[PDB]
Amino acid sequence: MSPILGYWKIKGLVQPTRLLLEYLEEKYEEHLYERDEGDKWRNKKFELGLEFPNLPYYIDGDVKLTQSMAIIRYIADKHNMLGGCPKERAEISMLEGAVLDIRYGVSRIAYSKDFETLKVDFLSKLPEMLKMFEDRLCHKTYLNGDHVTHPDFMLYDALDVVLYMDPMCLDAFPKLVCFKKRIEAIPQIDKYLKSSKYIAWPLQGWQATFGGGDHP
C-alpha cells in the first residue's frame, strides 16, 4: 500500500512535496480533487481518519497527516534530511519560513479584486526578500550546501510562481536564476516536469485573480 497524497489538482501548497517525493523516487498515489469536486472532498473530509481534516493530507501504512509543512517535513525526516543537530535543523526551518514569506506573500494578494495595486507593493518588497537567498547562494550550490533539502524545492516553487507574476523579477539575481535551472537539471525533476503527472497550472486555487483559472 503506497502512500496517498490528497490535494486539489493545482500546484498550491503541495507542489514542493511532490517535487521532494519525485526527487527521492518514492512511490506514491495522488487523490486529486478537480475544480468541481469540492462536494466530493466535503463528503470525505471527516471520513479519512484525519485528526485535523484538511488539504493536503498524506496517508500511508504508518501515519495520517494534514498541514502541508508537517507532510513535507515527515517525508524528509523519513530520509534523514531534516538536519543532524539542533543548529542545522533550525537553519533548515529558518529557510522554510523565509521561503513561505515569499510564497504566502503571493497567495495573500492573489485572491483580491485589486490584485494589480497590491502587486505593486509586493514587488517593491520582493527584491529584499530575494536578495537574502541570493547572498545565501553565492557560496552554496543548494540552500543547505552541497546536498538538496526540502527548502530547495520550496524555493523553487516560489521562484516559479513569482516569475509568472513578473518574468523579470530575477534579472538582478543571477544566483537565483541559476539555482532554478540547477533544480530543473536534477534528473528526477526533469523527468517529472516532462511526465504526465506534472500539474503546471493553476498556481493558486482556480478562483484566484492571479495564478487562477484553468489555463495560464
Ligand X SMILES: CCCCCCSC[C@H](NC(=O)CC[C@H]([NH3+])C(=O)O)C(=O)NCC(=O)O
SS3 20: helix
The whole-angstrom distance between residue 128's C-alpha and the CA centroid of its chain comes to 21
In angstroms, what is the minimal distance from the CB of 141 to ligand X? 25
By CB under 6 A, is residue 17 in contact with ligand X? no
Contact string (CB under 6 A) for ligand X, positions 108-147, x = contact: ----------------------------------------
Burial class of residue 51 in the structure, from the number of CB atoms within 10 Å of its CB (0-12 exposed, 13-18 middle, 19+ buried):
exposed
Residue (82 or 178) nearer to ligand X, CB = 82
Which range touches a copy of itself (CB under 8 A), out of 3-11, 33-41, 131-139, 206-214? Answer: 131-139
Of 159, 154, 183, nearest to 171 (Cα)? 159
- Residue 127 CB neighbours (<10 A): 12
C-alpha cell of residue 25: 523516487
C-alpha cell of residue 61: 501504512
Q: Is 107 annotated as a binding residue?
A: no
Residue (69 or 199) nearer to a copy of itself, CB = 69
Beta carbons of 68 and 56 less than 8 angstroms apart: yes
Q: Is 74 annotated as a binding residue?
A: no
In angstroms, what is the minimal distance from the CB of 195 to a copy of itself? 27
SS3 62: coil
Q: Is 80 annotated as a binding residue?
A: no
Eight-class DSSP state of 34: P
Residues lying near a copy of itself in the complex (CB under 8 A): 51-53, 62-63, 65-71, 73-74, 77-78, 82, 86-87, 89-91, 93-98, 108, 132, 135-136
Using CB under 6 A, list all residues that contact ligand X. 12-13, 45, 54-56, 67-69, 97, 101, 103-104, 107, 204-205
